[PDB]
Amino acid sequence: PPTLQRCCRQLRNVSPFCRCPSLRQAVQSAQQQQGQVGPQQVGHMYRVASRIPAICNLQPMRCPF
């Protein structure tokens, strides 16, 4: 399946209360696959991650971080 659909499937398997915490851990982990990422780019990655629960139709639909 396509990546976004796999993402929403993995996220859906996480408990609602754990989805925002888990997305924060994903942003951290994604940085390891890149190395030197500036603070502006890090903030953007959290912004993108923040949108994923709505895209997925998953509560809660936004993560403050």
């Binding site: 990546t3 993995q10 996220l11 994604a30 991650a49």
Partner: peptide, 25 residues
């Protein structure tokens, strides 16, 4: 702790990591 365990168990949200990288180029 519950959330960490669920993250690890769901493949460390590896596809979401891919999403987040895709829109962060």
């Amino acid at each position: 702790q519950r959330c960490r365990h669920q993250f690890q168990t769901q493949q460390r949200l590896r596809a979401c990591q891919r999403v987040i990288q895709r829109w962060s180029q």
